[PDB]
Tab-separated table of C-alpha atoms in Angstrom:
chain	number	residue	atom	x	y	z
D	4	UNK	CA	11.002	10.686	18.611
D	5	UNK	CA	7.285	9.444	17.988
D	6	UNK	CA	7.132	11.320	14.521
D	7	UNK	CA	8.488	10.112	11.312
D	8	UNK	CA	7.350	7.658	9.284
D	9	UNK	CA	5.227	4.536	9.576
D	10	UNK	CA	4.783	0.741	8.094
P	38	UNK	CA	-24.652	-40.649	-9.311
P	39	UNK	CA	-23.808	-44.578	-9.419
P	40	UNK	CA	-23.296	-44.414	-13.284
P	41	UNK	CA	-21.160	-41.144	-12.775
P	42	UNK	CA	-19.164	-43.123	-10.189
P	43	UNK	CA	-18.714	-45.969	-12.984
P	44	UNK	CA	-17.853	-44.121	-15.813
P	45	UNK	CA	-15.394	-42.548	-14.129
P	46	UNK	CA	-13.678	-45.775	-12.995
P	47	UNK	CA	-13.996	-47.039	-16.207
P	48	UNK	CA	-12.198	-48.177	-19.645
P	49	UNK	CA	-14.003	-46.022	-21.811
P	50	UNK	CA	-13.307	-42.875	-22.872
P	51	UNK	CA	-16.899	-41.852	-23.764
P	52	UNK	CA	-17.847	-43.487	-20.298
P	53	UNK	CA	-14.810	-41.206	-18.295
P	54	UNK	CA	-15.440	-38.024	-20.169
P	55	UNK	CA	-18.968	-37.500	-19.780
P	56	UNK	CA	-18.789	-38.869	-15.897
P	57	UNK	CA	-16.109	-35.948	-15.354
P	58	UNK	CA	-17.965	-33.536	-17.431
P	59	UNK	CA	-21.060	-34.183	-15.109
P	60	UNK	CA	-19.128	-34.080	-12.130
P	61	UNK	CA	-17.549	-30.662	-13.353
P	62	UNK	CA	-21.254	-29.720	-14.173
P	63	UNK	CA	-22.536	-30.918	-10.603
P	64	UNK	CA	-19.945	-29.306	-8.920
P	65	UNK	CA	-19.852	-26.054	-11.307
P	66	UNK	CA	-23.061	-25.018	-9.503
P	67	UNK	CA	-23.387	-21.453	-7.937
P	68	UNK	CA	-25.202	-22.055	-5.137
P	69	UNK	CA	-23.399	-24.672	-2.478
P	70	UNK	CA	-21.193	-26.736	-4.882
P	71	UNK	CA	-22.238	-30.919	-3.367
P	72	UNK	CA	-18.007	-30.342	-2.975
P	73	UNK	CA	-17.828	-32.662	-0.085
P	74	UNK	CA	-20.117	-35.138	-1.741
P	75	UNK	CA	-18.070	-35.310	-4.829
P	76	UNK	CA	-14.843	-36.122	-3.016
P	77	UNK	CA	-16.510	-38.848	-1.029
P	78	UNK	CA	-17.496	-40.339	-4.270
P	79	UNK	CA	-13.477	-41.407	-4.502
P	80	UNK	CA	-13.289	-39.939	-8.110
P	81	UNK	CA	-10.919	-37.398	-6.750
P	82	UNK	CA	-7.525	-39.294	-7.214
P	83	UNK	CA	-9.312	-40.391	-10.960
P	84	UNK	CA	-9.400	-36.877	-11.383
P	85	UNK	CA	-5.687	-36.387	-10.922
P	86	UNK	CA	-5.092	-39.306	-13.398
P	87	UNK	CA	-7.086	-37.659	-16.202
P	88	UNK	CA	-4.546	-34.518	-15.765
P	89	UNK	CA	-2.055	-36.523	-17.182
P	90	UNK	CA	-4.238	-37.662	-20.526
P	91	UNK	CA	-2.000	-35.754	-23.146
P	92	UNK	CA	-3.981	-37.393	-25.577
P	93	UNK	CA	-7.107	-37.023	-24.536
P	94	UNK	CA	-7.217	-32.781	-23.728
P	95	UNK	CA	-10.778	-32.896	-23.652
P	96	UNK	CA	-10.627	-34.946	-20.384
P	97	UNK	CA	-7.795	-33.310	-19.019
P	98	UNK	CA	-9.814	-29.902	-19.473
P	99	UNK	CA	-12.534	-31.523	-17.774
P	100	UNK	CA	-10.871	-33.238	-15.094
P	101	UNK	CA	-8.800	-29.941	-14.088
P	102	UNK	CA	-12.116	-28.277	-14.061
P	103	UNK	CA	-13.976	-30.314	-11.582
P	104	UNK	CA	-10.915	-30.491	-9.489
P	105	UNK	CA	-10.578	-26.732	-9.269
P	106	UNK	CA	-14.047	-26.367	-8.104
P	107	UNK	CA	-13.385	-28.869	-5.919
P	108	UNK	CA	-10.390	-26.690	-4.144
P	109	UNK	CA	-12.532	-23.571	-4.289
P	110	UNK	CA	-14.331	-25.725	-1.518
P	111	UNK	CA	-13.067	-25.530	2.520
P	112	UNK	CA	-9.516	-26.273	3.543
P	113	UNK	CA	-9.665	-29.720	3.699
P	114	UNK	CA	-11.304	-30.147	0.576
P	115	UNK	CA	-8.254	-28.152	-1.118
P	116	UNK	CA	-6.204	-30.270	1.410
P	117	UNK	CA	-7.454	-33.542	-0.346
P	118	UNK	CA	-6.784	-31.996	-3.506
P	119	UNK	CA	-2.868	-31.390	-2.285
P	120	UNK	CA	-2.486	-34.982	-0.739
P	121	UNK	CA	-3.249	-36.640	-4.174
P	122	UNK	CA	-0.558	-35.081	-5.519
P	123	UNK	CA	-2.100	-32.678	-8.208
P	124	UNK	CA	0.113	-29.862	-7.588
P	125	UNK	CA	3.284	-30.532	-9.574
P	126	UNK	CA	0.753	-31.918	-12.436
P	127	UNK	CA	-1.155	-28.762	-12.454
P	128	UNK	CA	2.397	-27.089	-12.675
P	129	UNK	CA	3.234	-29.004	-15.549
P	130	UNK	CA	0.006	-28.737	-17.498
P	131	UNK	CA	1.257	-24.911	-17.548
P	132	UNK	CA	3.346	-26.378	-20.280
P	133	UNK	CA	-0.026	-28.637	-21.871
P	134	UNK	CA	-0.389	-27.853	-25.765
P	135	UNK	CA	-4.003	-26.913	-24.928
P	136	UNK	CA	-4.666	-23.180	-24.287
P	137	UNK	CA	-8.062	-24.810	-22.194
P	138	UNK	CA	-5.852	-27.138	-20.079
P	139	UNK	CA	-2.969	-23.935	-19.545
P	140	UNK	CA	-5.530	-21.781	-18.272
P	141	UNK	CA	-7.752	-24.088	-15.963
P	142	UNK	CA	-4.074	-24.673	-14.795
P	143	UNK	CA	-3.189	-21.565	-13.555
P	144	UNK	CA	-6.851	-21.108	-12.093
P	145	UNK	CA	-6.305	-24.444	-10.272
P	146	UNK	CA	-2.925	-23.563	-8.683
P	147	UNK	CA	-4.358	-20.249	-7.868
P	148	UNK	CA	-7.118	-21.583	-5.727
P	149	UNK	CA	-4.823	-23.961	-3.798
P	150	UNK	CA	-2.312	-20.907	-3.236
P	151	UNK	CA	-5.223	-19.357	-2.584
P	152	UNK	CA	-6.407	-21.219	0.599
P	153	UNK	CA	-3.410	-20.466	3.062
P	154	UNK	CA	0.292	-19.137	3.018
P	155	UNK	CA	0.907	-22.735	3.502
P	156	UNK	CA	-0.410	-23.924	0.551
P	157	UNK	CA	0.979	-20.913	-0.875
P	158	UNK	CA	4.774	-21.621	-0.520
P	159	UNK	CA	4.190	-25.305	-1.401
P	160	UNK	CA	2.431	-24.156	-5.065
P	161	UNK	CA	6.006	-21.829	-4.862
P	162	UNK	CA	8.056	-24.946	-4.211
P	163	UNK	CA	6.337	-26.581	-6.965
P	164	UNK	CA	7.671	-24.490	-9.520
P	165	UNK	CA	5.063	-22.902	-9.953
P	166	UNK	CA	5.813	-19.148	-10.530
P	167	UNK	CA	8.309	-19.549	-13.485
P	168	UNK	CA	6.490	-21.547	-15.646
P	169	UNK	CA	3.723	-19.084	-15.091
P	170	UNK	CA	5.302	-16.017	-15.858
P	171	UNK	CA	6.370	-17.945	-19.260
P	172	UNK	CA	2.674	-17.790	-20.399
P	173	UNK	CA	2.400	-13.784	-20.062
P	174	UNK	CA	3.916	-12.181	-23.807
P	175	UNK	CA	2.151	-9.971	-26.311
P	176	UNK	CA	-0.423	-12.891	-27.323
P	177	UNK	CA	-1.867	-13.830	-24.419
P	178	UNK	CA	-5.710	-13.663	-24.175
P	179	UNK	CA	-7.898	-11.687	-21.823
P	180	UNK	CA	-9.059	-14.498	-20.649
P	181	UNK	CA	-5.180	-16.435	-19.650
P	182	UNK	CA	-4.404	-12.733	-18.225
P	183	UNK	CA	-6.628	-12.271	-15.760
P	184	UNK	CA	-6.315	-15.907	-14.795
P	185	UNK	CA	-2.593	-15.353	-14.755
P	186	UNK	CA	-2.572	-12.494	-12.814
P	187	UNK	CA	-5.228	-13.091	-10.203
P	188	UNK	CA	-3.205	-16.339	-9.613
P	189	UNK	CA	0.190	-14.058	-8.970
P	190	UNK	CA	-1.761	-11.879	-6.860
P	191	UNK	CA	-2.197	-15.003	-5.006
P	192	UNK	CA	0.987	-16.279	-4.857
P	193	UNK	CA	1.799	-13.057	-2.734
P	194	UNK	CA	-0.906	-12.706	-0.819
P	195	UNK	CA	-0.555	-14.117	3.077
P	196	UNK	CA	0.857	-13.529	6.253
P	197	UNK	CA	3.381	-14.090	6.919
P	198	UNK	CA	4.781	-12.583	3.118
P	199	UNK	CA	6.656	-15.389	1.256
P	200	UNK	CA	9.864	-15.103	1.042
P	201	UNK	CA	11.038	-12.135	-1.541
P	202	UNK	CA	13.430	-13.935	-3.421
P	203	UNK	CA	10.757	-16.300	-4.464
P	204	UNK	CA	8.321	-13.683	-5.441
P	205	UNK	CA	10.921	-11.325	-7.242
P	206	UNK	CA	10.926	-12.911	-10.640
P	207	UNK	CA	6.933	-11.819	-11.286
P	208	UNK	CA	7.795	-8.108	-11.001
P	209	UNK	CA	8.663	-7.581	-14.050
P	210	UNK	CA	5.291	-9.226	-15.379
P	211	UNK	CA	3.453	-7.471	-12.254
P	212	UNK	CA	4.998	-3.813	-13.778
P	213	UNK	CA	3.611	-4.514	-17.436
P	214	UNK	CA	0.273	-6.049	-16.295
P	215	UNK	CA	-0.355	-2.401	-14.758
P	216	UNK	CA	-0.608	-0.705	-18.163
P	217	UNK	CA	-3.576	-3.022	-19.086
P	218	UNK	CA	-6.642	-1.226	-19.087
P	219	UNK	CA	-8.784	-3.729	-17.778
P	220	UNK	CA	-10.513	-3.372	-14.576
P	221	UNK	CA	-9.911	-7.067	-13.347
P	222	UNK	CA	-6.458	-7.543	-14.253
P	223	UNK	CA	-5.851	-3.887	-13.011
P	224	UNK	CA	-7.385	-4.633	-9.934
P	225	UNK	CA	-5.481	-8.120	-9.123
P	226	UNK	CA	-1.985	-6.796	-10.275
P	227	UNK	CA	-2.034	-3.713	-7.835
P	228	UNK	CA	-3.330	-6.097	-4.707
P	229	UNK	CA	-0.289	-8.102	-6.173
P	230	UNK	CA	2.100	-4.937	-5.436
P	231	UNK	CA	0.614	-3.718	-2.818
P	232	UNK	CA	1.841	-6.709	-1.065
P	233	UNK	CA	6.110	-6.754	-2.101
P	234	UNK	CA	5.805	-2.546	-1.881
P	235	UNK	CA	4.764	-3.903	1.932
P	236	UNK	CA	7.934	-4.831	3.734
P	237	UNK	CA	11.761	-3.649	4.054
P	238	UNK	CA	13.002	-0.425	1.775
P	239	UNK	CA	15.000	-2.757	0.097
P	240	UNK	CA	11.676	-4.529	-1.205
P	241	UNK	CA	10.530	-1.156	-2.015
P	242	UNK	CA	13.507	-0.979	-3.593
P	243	UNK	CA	13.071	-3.813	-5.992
P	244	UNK	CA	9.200	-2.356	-6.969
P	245	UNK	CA	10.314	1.274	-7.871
P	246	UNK	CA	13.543	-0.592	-9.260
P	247	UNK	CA	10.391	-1.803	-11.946
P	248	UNK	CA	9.166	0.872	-12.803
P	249	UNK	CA	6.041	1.089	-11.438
P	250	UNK	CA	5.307	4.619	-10.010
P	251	UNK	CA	4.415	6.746	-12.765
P	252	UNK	CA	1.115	4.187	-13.766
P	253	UNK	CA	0.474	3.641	-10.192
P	254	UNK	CA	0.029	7.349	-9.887
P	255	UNK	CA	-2.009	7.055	-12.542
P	256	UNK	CA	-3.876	4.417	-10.941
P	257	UNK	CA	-5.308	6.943	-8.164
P	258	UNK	CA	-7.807	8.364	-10.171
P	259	UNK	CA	-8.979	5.650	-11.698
P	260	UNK	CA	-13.183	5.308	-11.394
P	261	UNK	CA	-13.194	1.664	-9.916
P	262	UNK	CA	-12.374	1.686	-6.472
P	263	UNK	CA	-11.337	-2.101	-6.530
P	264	UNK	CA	-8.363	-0.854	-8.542
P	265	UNK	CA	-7.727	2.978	-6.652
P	266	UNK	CA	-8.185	0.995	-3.113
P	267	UNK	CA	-5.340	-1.484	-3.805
P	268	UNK	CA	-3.107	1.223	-5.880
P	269	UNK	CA	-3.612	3.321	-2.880
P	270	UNK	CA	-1.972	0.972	-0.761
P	271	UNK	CA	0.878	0.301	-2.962
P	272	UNK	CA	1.482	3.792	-3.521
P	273	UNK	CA	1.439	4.465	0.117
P	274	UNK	CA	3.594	1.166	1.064
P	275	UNK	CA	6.044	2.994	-1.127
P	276	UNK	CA	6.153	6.675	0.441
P	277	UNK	CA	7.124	4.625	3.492
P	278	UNK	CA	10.276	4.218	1.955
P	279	UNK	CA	13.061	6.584	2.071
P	280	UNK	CA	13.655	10.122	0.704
P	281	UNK	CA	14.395	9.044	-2.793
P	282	UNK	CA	12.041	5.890	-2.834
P	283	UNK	CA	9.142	8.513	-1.869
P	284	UNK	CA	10.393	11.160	-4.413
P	285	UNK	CA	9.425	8.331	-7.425
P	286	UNK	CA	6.063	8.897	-6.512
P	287	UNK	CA	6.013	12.635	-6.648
P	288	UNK	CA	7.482	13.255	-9.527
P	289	UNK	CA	4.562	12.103	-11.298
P	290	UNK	CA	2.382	14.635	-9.727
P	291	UNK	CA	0.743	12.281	-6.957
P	292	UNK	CA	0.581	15.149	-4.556
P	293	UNK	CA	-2.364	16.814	-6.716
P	294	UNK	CA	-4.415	13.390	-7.446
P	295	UNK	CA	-4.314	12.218	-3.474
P	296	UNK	CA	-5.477	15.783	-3.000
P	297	UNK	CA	-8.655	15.262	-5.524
P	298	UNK	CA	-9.407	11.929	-2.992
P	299	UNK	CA	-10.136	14.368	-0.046
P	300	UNK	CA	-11.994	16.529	-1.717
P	301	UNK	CA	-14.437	14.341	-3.870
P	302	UNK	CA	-16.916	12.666	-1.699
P	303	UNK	CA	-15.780	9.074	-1.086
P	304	UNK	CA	-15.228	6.135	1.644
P	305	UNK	CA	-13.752	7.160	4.816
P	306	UNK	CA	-11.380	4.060	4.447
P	307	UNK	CA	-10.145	5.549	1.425
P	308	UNK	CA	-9.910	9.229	2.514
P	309	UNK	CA	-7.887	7.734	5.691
P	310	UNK	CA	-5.665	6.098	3.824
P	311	UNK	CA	-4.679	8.977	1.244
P	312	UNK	CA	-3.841	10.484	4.466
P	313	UNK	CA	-2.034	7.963	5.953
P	314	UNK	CA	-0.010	8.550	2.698
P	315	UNK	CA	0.179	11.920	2.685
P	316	UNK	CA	1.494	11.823	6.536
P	317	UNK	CA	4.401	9.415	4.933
P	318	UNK	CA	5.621	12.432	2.656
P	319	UNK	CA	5.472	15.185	4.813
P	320	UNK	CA	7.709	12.785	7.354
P	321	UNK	CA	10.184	13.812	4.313
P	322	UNK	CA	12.687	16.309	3.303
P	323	UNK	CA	11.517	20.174	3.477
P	324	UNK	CA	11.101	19.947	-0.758
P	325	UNK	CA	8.988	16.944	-0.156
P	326	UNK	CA	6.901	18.920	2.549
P	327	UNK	CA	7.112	21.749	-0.548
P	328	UNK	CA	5.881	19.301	-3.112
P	329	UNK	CA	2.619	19.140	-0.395
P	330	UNK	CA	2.533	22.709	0.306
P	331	UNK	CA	2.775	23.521	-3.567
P	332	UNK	CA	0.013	21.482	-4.405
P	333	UNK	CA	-2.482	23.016	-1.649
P	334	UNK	CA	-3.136	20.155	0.376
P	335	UNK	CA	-2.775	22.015	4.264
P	336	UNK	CA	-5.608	23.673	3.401
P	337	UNK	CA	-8.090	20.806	3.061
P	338	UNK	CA	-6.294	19.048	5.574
P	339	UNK	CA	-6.527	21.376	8.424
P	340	UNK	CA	-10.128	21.151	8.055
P	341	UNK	CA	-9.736	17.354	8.000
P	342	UNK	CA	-8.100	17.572	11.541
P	343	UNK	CA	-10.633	19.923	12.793
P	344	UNK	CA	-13.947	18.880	11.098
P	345	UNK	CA	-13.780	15.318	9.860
P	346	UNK	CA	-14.646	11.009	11.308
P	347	UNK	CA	-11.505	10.460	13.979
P	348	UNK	CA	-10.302	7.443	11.973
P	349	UNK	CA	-9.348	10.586	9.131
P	350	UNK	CA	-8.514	13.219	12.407
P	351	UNK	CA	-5.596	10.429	13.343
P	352	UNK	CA	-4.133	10.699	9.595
P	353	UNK	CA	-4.647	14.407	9.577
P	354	UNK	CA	-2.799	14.620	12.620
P	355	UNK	CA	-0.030	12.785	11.561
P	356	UNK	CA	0.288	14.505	8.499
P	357	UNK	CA	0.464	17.722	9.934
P	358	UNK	CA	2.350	17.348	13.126
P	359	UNK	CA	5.331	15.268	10.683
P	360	UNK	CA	5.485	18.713	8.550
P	361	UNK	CA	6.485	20.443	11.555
P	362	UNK	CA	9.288	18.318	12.460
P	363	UNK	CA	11.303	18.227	9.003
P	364	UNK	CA	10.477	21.799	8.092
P	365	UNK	CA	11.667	24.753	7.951
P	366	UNK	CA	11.038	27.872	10.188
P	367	UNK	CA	8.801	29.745	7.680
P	368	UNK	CA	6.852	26.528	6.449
P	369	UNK	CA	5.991	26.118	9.560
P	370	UNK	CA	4.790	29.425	9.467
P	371	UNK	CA	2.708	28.626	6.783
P	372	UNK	CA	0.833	25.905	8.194
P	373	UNK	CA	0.094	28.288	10.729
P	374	UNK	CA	-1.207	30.566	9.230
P	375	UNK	CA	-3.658	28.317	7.432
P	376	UNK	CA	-4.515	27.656	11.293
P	377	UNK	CA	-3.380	24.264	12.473
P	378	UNK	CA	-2.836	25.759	16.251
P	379	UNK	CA	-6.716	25.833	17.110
P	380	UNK	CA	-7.369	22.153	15.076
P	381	UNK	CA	-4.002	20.538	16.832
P	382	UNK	CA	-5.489	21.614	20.391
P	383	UNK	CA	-9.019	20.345	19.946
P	384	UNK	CA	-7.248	16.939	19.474
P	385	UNK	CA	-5.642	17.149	22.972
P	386	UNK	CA	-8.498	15.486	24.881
P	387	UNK	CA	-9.060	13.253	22.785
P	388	UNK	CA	-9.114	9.249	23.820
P	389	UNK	CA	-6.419	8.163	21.432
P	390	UNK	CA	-3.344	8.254	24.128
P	391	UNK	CA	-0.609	7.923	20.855
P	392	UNK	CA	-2.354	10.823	19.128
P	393	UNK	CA	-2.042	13.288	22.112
P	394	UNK	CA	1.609	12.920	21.947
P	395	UNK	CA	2.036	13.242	18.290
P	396	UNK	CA	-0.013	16.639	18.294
P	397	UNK	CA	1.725	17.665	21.740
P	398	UNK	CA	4.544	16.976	19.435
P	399	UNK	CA	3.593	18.786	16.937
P	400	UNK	CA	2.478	21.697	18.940
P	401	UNK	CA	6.223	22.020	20.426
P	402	UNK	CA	7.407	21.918	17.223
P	403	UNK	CA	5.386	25.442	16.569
P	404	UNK	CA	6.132	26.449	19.752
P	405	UNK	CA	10.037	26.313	19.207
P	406	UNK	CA	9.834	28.236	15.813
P	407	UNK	CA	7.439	31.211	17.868
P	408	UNK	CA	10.332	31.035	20.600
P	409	UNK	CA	12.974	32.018	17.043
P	410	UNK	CA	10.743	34.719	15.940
P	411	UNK	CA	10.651	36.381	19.695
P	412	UNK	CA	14.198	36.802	19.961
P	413	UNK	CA	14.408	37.815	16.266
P	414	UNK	CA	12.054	40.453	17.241
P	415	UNK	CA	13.174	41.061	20.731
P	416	UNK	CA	9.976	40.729	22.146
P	417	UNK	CA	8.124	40.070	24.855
P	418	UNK	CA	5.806	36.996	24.317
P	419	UNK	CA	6.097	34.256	22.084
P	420	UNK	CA	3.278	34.843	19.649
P	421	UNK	CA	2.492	30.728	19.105
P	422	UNK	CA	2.112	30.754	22.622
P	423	UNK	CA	-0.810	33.349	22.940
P	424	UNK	CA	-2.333	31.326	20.082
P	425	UNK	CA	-2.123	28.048	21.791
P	426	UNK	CA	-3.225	30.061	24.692
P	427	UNK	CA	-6.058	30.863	22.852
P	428	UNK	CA	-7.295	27.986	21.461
P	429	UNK	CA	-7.876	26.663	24.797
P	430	UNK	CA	-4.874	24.424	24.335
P	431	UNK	CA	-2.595	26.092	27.318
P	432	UNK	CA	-5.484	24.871	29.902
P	433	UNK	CA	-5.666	21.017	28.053
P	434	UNK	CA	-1.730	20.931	28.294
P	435	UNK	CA	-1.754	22.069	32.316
P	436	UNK	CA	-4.711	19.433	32.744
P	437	UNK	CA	-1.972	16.929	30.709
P	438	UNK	CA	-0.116	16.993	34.046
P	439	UNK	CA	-2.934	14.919	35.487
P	440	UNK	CA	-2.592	12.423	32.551
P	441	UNK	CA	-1.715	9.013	33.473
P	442	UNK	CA	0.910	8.112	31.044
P	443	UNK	CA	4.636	9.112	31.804
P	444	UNK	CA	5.153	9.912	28.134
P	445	UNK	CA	2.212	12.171	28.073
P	446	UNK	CA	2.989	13.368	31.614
P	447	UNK	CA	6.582	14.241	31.003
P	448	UNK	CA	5.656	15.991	27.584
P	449	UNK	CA	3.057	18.671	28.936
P	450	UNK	CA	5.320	19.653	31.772
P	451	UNK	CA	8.522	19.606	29.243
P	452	UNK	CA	6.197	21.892	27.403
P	453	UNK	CA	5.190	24.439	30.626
P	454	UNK	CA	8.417	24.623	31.605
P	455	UNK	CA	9.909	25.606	28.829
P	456	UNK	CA	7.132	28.266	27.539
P	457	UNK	CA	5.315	28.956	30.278
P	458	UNK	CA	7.312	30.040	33.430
């Protein structure tokens, strides 16, 4: 839920 | 200056041309450019009338000249530049029989799109982007391309982004530009993707769509970091992208070049960033997290997380604690085993509040693949656990109960409760 990707 | 004034004003063509080539001259000056003192000279909107000279190209040259240097000025001086109208005529002098008058053109219109995303969309609005693109084929001189294309860069530039429709048609130019060799237009065409890679996948989309990755990969070990630091970007605003958006990328090896830009001794900006990139593809598929693996970049980056700046330690972090939540049971193995436990713990105090929950995260992530192996085993201790345990990270997690934040709080207990009864 806060990992994954990113902008 | 009262003869310049005159000349200027006046019938004569000898009189206007060598007024506006002094004016040019006084305001082509390196050091503080009299800009505001040319303007209040009222020559400005004679300027604009000289544009339109067909037959005099000389004085159009001139004229478009002083009246670019003029706009390289503050805001309001490329505001007074706007207000007399010279946009659409700078626009249509994109179309001027003289190669002199085309290319002062575009390096006009680039300095008013230049000054603000609202000058930018009214250059757009203008017209200005198709008749550009127009002077971009196989004989176009150095000179017209890196005018050209530090001009598109500009045109894209700004927040917020223009709109993507109106910035489409120069990918195609944008995606043959990148095959130049030269440093400059090189440099200005990647800053030009890096900002329509920088958006929705759909825009991301359009760029790979264009056939871009395979030189941009390329791009990453180029010597000049003005071109690698805005290739970097685009490359990384792409791996943001989905499964198959990121997988143009590695197929052209990219994993092995952003691995040489750890290891070779440069900027911190630019070693965070390969990371930040590099955390983007192991928040991919388990063959993606492979494609990482294969190319041997856990090792460096453990000692990254554990030994390098914190503005790198975040990325690291990231990186890592992504790999353990899309792979599989014996890759995760693997990145412990090249000891991520001890280097995800240190990172557990530190003042970053977002970071402690990625690598408590991350360290759950381990803990639930140790929790596998001891029923697999039928034992009696999760193994993780006595290496979390170890690396004083079982004592930073019970102090976690202390923390603060609810997300952090909630996390560390989660964590106790469910490995450490």
């Amino acid at each position: 839920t806060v990992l994954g990707k990113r902008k | 200056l009262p003869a310049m004034i005159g000349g200027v004003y006046s019938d004569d063509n000898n009189l206007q041309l060598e007024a506006t080539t002094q004016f040019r001259k006084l305001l082509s000056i390196e050091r503080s450019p009299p800009i505001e003192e040319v303007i209040q000279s009222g020559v400005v909107p004679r300027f604009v009338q000289f544009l339109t000279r067909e037959d005099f190209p000389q004085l159009q040259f001139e004229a478009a000249w002083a009246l670019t240097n003029i706009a390289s000025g503050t805001s309001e001086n490329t505001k007074v530049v706007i207000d007399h109208g010279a946009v659409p005529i700078f626009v249509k002098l994109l179309g001027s029989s003289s190669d002199d008058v085309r290319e002062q053109a575009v390096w006009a219109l680039g300095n008013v799109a230049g000054d603000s995303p609202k000058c930018r969309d009214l250059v757009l609005a203008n017209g200005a982007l198709l008749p550009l693109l127009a002077q971009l084929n196989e004989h176009t001189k150095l000179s017209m391309l890196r005018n050209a294309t530090w001009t598109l860069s500009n045109f894209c530039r700004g927040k917020p982004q223009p709109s993507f429709e109106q910035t489409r048609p120069a990918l195609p130019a944008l995606a043959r530009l990148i095959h130049s060799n030269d440093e400059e237009v090189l440099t200005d065409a990647c800053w030009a993707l890096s900002y329509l890679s920088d958006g929705t996948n759909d825009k991301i989309q359009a760029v790979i769509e264009a056939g871009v990755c395979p030189r941009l990969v390329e791009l990453l070990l180029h010597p000049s970091p003005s071109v690698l630091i805005p290739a970097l970007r685009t490359v990384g605003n792409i791996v943001t992208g989905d499964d198959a958006q990121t997988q143009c990328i590695i197929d052209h090896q990219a994993l092995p070049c952003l691995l040489s830009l750890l290891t070779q001794n440069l900027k911190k900006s630019i070693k965070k960033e390969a990371c930040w990139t590099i955390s983007n593809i192991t928040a991919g598929n388990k063959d993606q997290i492979q494609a990482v693996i294969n190319a041997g970049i856990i090792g460096p980056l453990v000692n990254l997380l554990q030994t390098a700046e914190f503005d790198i330690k975040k990325e690291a972090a990231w990186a890592i604690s992504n790999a353990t939540s899309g792979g599989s049971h014996d890759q995760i193995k693997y990145l412990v085993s090249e000891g991520c436990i001890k280097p995800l713990c240190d990172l557990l105090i530190c003042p970053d509040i977002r970071i402690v929950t990625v690598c408590l995260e991350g360290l759950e992530n381990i803990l639930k693949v140790g929790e596998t192996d001891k029923t697999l085993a039928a034992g009696d201790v999760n193994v993780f656990s006595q290496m979390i345990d170890e690396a004083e990270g079982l004592e930073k997690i019970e102090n976690l109960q202390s923390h603060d934040n609810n997300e952090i709080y909630e996390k560390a207990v989660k964590i106790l409760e469910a490995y450490w009864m």
